[PDB]
């Protein structure tokens, strides 16, 4: 669930 916006975009699954 963690995708923080700032680039480069970092999305983790949970």
Known sequence: ???TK???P???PD
Do not use: E, V
Request: charged fraction near 10%; glycine fraction near 12%.
């Open 1 to 3: 669930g963690r995708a």
């Open 6 to 8: 700032s680039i480069p």
């Open 10 to 12: 970092i999305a983790f």
